[PDB]
Amino acid sequence: GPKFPRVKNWELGSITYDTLCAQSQQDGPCTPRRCLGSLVLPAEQLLSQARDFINQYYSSIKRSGSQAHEERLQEVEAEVASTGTYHLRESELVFGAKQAWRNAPRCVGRIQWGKLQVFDARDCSSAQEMFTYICNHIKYATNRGNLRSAITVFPQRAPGRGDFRIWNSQLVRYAGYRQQDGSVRGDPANVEITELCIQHGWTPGNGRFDVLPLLLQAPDEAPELFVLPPELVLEVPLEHPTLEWFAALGLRWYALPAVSNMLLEIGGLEFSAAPFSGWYMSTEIGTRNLCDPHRYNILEDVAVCMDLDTRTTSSLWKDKAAVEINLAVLHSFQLAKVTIVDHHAATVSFMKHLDNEQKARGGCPADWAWIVPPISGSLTPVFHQEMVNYILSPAFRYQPDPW
Amino acid sequence: KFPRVKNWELGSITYDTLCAQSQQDGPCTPRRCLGSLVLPAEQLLSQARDFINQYYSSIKRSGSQAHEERLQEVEAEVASTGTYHLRESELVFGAKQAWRNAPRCVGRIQWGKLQVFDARDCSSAQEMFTYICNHIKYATNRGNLRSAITVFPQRAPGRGDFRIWNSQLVRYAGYRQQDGSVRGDPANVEITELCIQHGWTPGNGRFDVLPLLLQAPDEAPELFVLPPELVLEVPLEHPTLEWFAALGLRWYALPAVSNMLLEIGGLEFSAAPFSGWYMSTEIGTRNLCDPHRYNILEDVAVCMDLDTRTTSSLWKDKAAVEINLAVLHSFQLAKVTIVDHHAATVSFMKHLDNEQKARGGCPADWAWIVPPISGSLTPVFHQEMVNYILSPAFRYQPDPW
């Protein structure tokens, strides 16, 4: 075989070689001495990143080496020469946004990558206007439960000028209220953002599922607080298909997963606000959000209702309750006619995507620890699939909280 | 320099300083991570010196007379012969350290408790067999399982290796059928076929224990049947599901890995089988539910009368849990040592804390440490891990055929 990583599927016995990794222009955290694959967090410069991106764009429309390609390159360097930055054409932004999704190693939903609605909000000049754009995104994306993948792109970062930022990590989040006894009512993931919303004058609720308002920041201004109109935020009360008491627990989740604190980098340009959204894989809600010990932590409650023996690990009470909670999430979203995908169907699709990308680009960057679902890992085909992880650009990158 | 390591459930942070002790590169580079992939005198002398330094350090006698004179002996033997030999107590220390150092093992809380049988005076396949039988008897201990390793003679420059051809001491046959399907364990079709070719008369069951193919240097391997009385097995039944027992399922008590190489101070032990006890997910999830193994999920789901037509009924998940529960209940009933994945991962977290204090870190392979079901329900899911190769070490080796 070739001087490229060999990649094996242990269920099927099939082999591929990843040649796409040669295109990686950015170092990850691993070295020959030690693997750090499981850690959650990681003039001339701009111009070479820009050239690379324009080359990618022209290769994607099959015009590599043409005068249009050469003219665009010249236009970009003259823009940078005199202004220090450059700007993307509308179709370049569209291509770049889809490519950043395609390149995201942690996303199992990439079979959908070519179907992304790209809203261009590069004309936005105020917090109020960000709010309008965001409500529009939410309405389009939710589409009354027939969810449509989308991204809204606000103005890029500029030399010595402040950033557009959405302070919330998602467009929809539940409040976390720190109680006097030290415990938390609502989502403990969101204690800090809830605390900041109150400081900026939000009148807080007192429930387990209170939708947070948005803190939105335009360049060089304090952030401004905006409450989402409730009719815009689609939620799904959770019930179980056979266990009738489950509805009585008053659990719920929102329909729209919309990540809003990631930086979108395209050709050296940095879009510090570019919230994007798809639809849920059910285990995100049923396993992580509801059962993580540092989240809603409902496993014991549900096991008590199912009358399990919670005093001993070998009864597998945690496993049994987790399964029924995950089943409840699927059933309820299906009943409410809100788009959702189970972990079996999602991982099958990702395997198909792997085959697609092998043919199209000669590999696919994938982070095995994130792609493998948090329940039933080896019951899904991705557990048996070796994966190579590397950074490609355009990319979504985590960015530090602005506060 | 030193990697920051965070637990996302508790918010606690440590720094791994142990990784600086690594002398051997893994498969990753800054360009790409390959963490999910499954697979002369001076050089030997420095590995040997280092191991001896490790040894005298462990008994708190660094720089003592015994330490200086032992370094002399090693040097003299290598200068003269190009190799050397370990003393029994050194071998015992090195075997425990290789277990301690093994990144894919969730059972390492037990690392200091290991019975070491010195079999380096073995000169024939027949002798290998007696040693293996004794190991099995000792480790099994009527179901009260005890960790053990038996170390056969080291590799030598001149000649072929002592090798056990079987990947474990106890495996079930896999019989390829006219229709290309497999009866028994599909993971074992090749070794089954080798046994038949070396004169084994095969059974035709789903759980026929394989004979051993044992190899002394530069000889054809030899076939030995394990006396059935030595091989402890557990019939599988379910606490509430009566029909489960009638699936006729069983597994053997003793997990005993026999194809790995044990490397201690530059010396290589190509046959050095080791055994502990099972974590129940290995049997319940991987061996019985992998599609390329016994693949029983669908049969069981139908017995449970689940809706098999659609993934979103979570029929696979439901069936998998009940199979795992059956494994645990049946081992507990038969009074055979077993540990569930919640208990094992909780003890592994304790091991991590013990090692931080003892050594400043612990090499761990997240993809192998997190169990194949209910991953995020265990504490190890939320624990970042640093992977690297320390020596003494267990390592994979090519099949001898």
Ligand code: HEM
């Ligand atoms: C179409 C339906 C989609 C599904 C089912 C899906 C699925 C997932 C899942 C399960 C994760 C892991 C999330 C976690 O545990 O935190 C993830 C992460 C991610 N997804 Fe997708 N996704 C979808 C759409 C999208 C879209 C439209 C984008 C961007 C255009 C996207 C980009 C990403 C990125 C950048 C991550 C990593 C986020 C992080 O590091 O926190 N996904 N996705």
Ligand code: HEM
């Ligand atoms: C005492 C009870 C033990 C438990 C519960 C345990 C648990 C486990 C588990 C679950 C794995 C992953 C297995 C797989 O999926 O193939 C593993 C791997 C491993 N264990 Fe332990 N183990 C135990 C004893 C031992 C002992 C005594 C040794 C050596 C002296 C050992 C050395 C290893 C090694 C080298 C691996 C990686 C094997 C490979 O690469 O295939 N273990 N162990």
Ligand SMILES: Cc1cc(N)nc(C[C@@H]2CNC[C@@H]2NCCNCCc2cccc(F)c2)c1
């Ligand atoms: C510290 C840090 C780093 C990082 N990369 N990330 C985070 C957000 C964490 C990751 N894990 C839980 C939480 N993120 C939860 C929100 N993720 C939904 C992803 C999703 C699903 C479907 C469609 C979409 F468009 C997006 C934190």
Ligand SMILES: Cc1cc(N)nc(C[C@@H]2CNC[C@@H]2NCCNCCc2cccc(F)c2)c1
């Ligand atoms: C190709 C390859 C490489 C490698 N390093 N390894 C393998 C054996 C595979 C790994 N995964 C399934 C199968 N190994 C069989 C399971 N091994 C039992 C581990 C164990 C458990 C409890 C106590 C013990 F002492 C030992 C294959």
Ligand SMILES: C[C@H](O)[C@H](O)[C@H]1CNc2nc(N)[nH]c(=O)c2N1
């Ligand atoms: C420590 C570990 O890397 C961390 O808990 C990861 C594991 N895999 C994950 N996978 C997904 N999809 N989402 C996550 O938040 C995590 N958390």
Ligand SMILES: C[C@H](O)[C@H](O)[C@H]1CNc2nc(N)[nH]c(=O)c2N1
């Ligand atoms: C491709 C992937 O690395 C492979 O399926 C691994 C995943 N994790 C594992 N974990 C354990 N404990 N045992 C295994 O055999 C595997 N297989």
Ligand SMILES: [Zn+2]
């Ligand atoms: Zn790595």
